[PDB]
Write a protein that binds this ligand. Structure first.
Ligand SMILES: COC(=O)c1ccc(S(N)(=O)=O)cc1
Ligand SMILES: COC(=O)c1ccc(S(N)(=O)=O)cc1
Ligand SMILES: COC(=O)c1ccc(S(N)(=O)=O)cc1
Ligand SMILES: COC(=O)c1ccc(S(N)(=O)=O)cc1
Ligand SMILES: COC(=O)c1ccc(S(N)(=O)=O)cc1
Lengths: 348, 348, 348, 348, 348
């Protein structure tokens, strides 16, 4: 018995949809769902999606509340749809996928992922759910996560962090590092070697290596000396050049995090979505240096050093391709006289 | 288990709410309710009310589908709320009453009319429903309709016509003439002797007596002669003066009906509600004669003749009270030398 | 270069999208598209769909303006999507199909119907367009219409009438009768022998045979006698029983047409979509007889007589399957002593 | 003290804004204005404009309720704004002009037309209002209407008809024929000799000369003979060619009127504004003949005959300029061997 | 080729409008512009303006991204419109001006500021744009900013700070201090001597003089002693009196900034716009002292001291006028026995 008033009952009483029975009074005004509590209306949900308000309300209530892969990982692996769950995209306040399987009548294309309409779609399977590993084994196209080994399949070790109710974290009381498996046209793929973005914040950035601790703590000249980074243009790429009207470089999050301590700056997230490479229209408050499209990536500084130290520095400009978050990220590498000039996620 | 999807199920399968088990998928976008039928969205209801879209949808679905009093009658009798039903105002596309009793969890102020919140409210009771004559006896305030005699209760014979799903009709396969009863502060009230308006249209007006057949068919001069109406100014009051820029008189619907068969005219229904006296901004298409506030009433011409001839014609101006549709309707009577000049519903 | 302003340019200058170069200024406010004409805003389109306003505007502008099958036909044949055109559902003021193929970047699931996403979908092909007969041959699922013979393909002769810009007509200056073909899972399907509904209105109903001319003109008794219909209960089924509170029978449009010339009645089209069998909440204005779910179908009276006379009249009740508009329509047949009691489209 | 509640008071009590003291309670929800009447909300106004709901409500309430020029006339004369009144465009349900002068605090660009902001704008002046003839004399740009002679000002006799509360009529109890005057850059302009469109409808078309009575009554052959119209192609231009898939000709309203009495047809008014030449997407219900852009004009048939016979028939194609409603209307004239092939308003 | 989809292309790919060619899919739901990225809708822009959503979207995309004068300066100088740019009002999330010149078709009153409609309007000219100084020379009314001297015109030196993408800053890598020039009716004006507001924040307030450093660092008694401010009522005016139910004084931002460190308070910005004098409904959290209209100005404390020390302290109350941000700010000065009682931006 699926209904608007029962979904709202579950939200009010269980904090999300929990399969409980019961009903509460609901009123819907424009894009907002209210419920009556002692004669006054209380807001339960504001639709920020392009779906009908009652549809989005139900999908949000039925969101996965376990640690799930970040949306960028699912997108990079080509996931089209989830099996009997909703991956909620907290960066868009919207479902991560258009349709559902066995979740909501208005958005379901099927009740079970074994139905034929699901066969060409890359379905996300959660090994922590009973029988979903076996469903993946029979699936034509799909992506599977597990916490342990799967007999007969070589795993791909994913990122340490996952998303729990919109909080990206490395789990201490829960497991957030999953084994990844992917199947195309019934064939189990080898997932490529990949770096992983670290998914940290500008405001509350925490280092995850001794080099990152040293980058935040030491001065620019001292750090570049200690780790022998002369000629790699970290002054431009990581620390940022604020001397001209266009902001120079500043493509690594830890470089923004170090600057954000001393003086703040404005980042306009003009494509607000989860993606491996993020683009911002940045304005430095202290100097007035700005840049319309500033690509930023949060790589472990050790990984970024390894990437840039593993490149031929002998051509003026060329495309450098790096597998990050299971997708191919193109970089532009500019060199002169054997040293790095700039190195940025390519704007294409 | 009341729910949006169950209400929509009943509408789709039974034409209205019928207490049936079932659910269909529903999407709400702005003020409209849709349901999925074979892949595409079909409109079930457009909210024209000031209530939330899903609330109004339920009240419309639970509308009374038996012949019920016209809203102007219930208004004139001071009805505030209905006992366990919804009187739908088809002229406003909205519930006739703000609140409900045992109908909808969002608008209910009580489950049963015996709850003390209902005592100071005039509750409409339907004697055709089991136990509601008794509920009227026990109610502090109320209006009761019955199809027959209630022992000890002095009846008031209501109008011949009632409203069935927005259609105003004199019932043949159903009864539409009711006994009316009213209680104020626990005390049954004597309802006044009254005329009743005829509730006809301008498009499909039909006479209901020999005098009305005469009016529509005879010219103005021979009708006034046949029914001895000289000095009563039907030339102004009923037939209408279109010679000057301000339209003169034209306050009986039958007069508008006669003119409409010859030349059309525009009626700006600037307060579009059911009421005994209706006001329109009228523009005559043929002559350009117009009037901003032209009050119109549909009395049987026999009745109107009986009212205007009952009058003392020896004062210049006076207010004339007439009981119509159980409410007191003030007229203005202007006379000169023992003949009527004008006689119109007094604009308040 | 597809754009909102270009679509509006085509609407303003060519009456619809015509692939022309140009732009006009457009303002969007709520669900309405306006364009500036000499200083003031003029309404071009009001979105009655569940799609975004600018998306629906484009699909409406790109609607098929040739005679096309009525939506109920395409629905009965299981059509999910159209090949490189938009079938506009004028009864819903919305696209007949959720998605498009090579029409609009926001609704397109493919550019050409050969893309594998289109294979499991029944694609509508128009043989009047170059290359689409071939695209039908190569499609896994599809429905094809042609104006003439396709070599080797066994045709099904469609209805005489088609829809031209929302007008249902039998073409004289254009052809509206098509050959129909259907494919399921790569295999051409034999379309069943079928009757076709006549797609007429209650306002402007016109007979299409001597028997229908007889029905509209003769009284009930002499028509039943002339066409030997005693014991088949046209008194109930076709003419309608208005004596009781529940309206009896009245399931043929021609029967509603006869009654409408005498007294009007209200038809609540509570599922306003094109379908072979239509359901209405009907209220008879003259008598007050009414019915919540009154199924109505517009069969040529000759056909309906041929169907009801084909029936075994020796069982109390049984389901009677009739193929109409290519779909199987279940009727309920109630008999007594070798005469028909009632025969109506079975409410599901 | 201008206010929303005062404007609503005037609408409720006087049918429009009448400068009266008073207030009634108002609720605004989405684009609709409601007022409380005996416990329930009644709709006073639905905003169909691109202005805020309360702003449009005030402008509609302050609309001119005297006979005023039709919007196409004011448009053709280049009017941008009205002096101390609102010309309501009933065909757009919106103000005819973006801004106001001394009408509404939200739309006012000035309190009086003498303010210098009004100088470069063509201001409409109503000589029936005290002092506005003088304001026209002092205005840099303007259009003036009067009911009589203005000393020294050479008049232009306007059309017989005007608009009274959305009703277009030739006044009998009021005057609707005005003298027209126009000023550009402080200099009075000579208005051109012009025909006037008749502003009739397709539903209620009525002839206005013996020739038009002949057209509606006679068959095509005897009318063409009686009025010596052989070789002028009224068979195409006025009567309409419905034999081919593209509808041929049919550019005079009287021709559409004749056809409509026989078989109906659909007119898609895809630019729904008042204009001298109207464009429609037309579909003939009988034949299926259709045309995407069918320009229609309502000239008195006498005038149209006088125009087409004035023409040199010795060129293959040429643009023909005719002054109608004070604006220059380009026609296309196609001839062959001294006879007319087609003559239509040139699509721009 | 100006279009919605191309504006969105520029936003997605260049962070703002950059004249690039290309199109992306766009959907518009209520007041929000979305674009499709890999099958999911991503929000690009939420309309907070009173313009149509697609119009505001285009103007925001075309905003000036160079350091521009703060909106209060432009308003105080009477700027009506900008020449070939959009000044975006980040405090209102709306365009700073109603109309545009050569920016957007829906809002343009002209393509070039030399057109006659621009002559009476005070047009903003940016000397950093080629040929705009010369356009100012020929402009009837206008305001010009430059970074260097203009031959033949005496400059007015503006504030040190300007707005870069909504960030008010004193430019270090860009120039934010402009020369100001103004012309009324073709005559170059002398701009008056003026103080400038400092445009600082409550949260991150930074001193700009040794006296301001001392005010933040020293105690009240110590500071008033060091700078000999006895009798000027800085205890009331600048430090604030929180001992009574009405908050006393507190009209200088640096006084709020000092208090906000120790204990916070609520400021309601009930007219949220850029203005030289700001009014707040303030509630002190620590004490509960509050004031409905508390005018606040951010003057350099040295400038505020100079202003108050340059006044006659001998009358009970009088209006003190000070030129700030090129506009005349009225102050109320209250004195008793030769010392200051209060001194506040006059609430009028
Ligand atoms: C300043 O921009 C960021 O705060 C940011 C955060 C995370 C990432 S990430 N994990 O996609 O590389 C990229 C950028
Ligand atoms: C033009 O005015 C009417 O159409 C009208 C109809 C009915 C009534 S009524 N039933 O209140 O008397 C009053 C006025
Ligand atoms: C009152 O009901 C109708 O007006 C109606 C019209 C047409 C059809 S149809 N073309 O499906 O048979 C069915 C019903
Ligand atoms: C079908 O087209 C019309 O109904 C129509 C009416 C009036 C005019 S008009 N007054 O501009 O000449 C033009 C066209
Ligand atoms: C508490 O109020 C403020 O934060 C504030 C900031 C700036 C200005 S200012 N530059 O207009 O004078 C005025 C007030």
């Amino acid at each position: 018995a699926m209904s608007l008033e029962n979904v709202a009952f579950n939200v009010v009483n269980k904090g999300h949809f929990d399969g409980q029975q019961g009903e509460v009074p609901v009123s819907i005004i424009n894009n907002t769902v209210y419920t009556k509590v002692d004669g006054v209306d209380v807001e339960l949900f504001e639709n920020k999606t392009t779906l009908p308000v009652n549809v989005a309300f139900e999908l949000w209530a039925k969101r996965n509340i376990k640690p799930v892969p970040e949306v960028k990982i699912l997108n990079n692996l080509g996931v089209d749809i989830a099996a009997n769950t909703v991956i909620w995209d907290y960066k868009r306040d919207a479902p991560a996928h258009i349709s559902t399987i066995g979740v909501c009548s208005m958005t379901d294309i099927a009740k079970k992922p074994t139905e034929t309409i699901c066969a060409p779609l890359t379905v996300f399977f959660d090994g922590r759910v009973d029988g979903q590993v076996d469903l993946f084994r029979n699936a034509r196209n799909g992506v599977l996560i597990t916490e342990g080994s799967v007999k007969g399949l070589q795993p791909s070790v994913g990122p340490k962090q996952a998303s729990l109710n919109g909080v990206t974290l490395i789990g201490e009381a829960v497991k957030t590092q999953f084994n990844y498996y992917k199947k195309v046209d019934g064939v189990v793929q080898q997932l490529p070697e990949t770096y992983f973005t670290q998914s940290r914040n500008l405001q509350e950035f925490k280092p995850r290596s001794q080099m990152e601790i040293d980058f935040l703590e030491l001065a620019m000249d001292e750090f570049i000396e200690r780790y022998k980074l002369e000629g790699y243009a970290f002054e431009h790429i990581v620390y940022g050049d604020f001397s001209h009207s266009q902001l120079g470089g500043l493509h690594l999050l830890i470089g923004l995090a170090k600057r954000f301590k001393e003086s703040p700056f404005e980042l306009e997230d003009f494509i607000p979505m989860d993606s491996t490479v993020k683009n911002y229209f940045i304005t430095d408050a202290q100097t007035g240096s700005s840049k319309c499209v500033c690509s930023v990536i949060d790589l472990l500084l050790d990984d970024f050093v390894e990437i840039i130290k593993s490149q031929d520095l002998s051509v003026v400009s060329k495309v450098v391709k790096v597998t990050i978050d299971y997708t191919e990220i193109s970089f532009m590498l500019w060199c002169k006289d054997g040293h790095v000039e700039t190195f940025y996620p390519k704007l294409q």
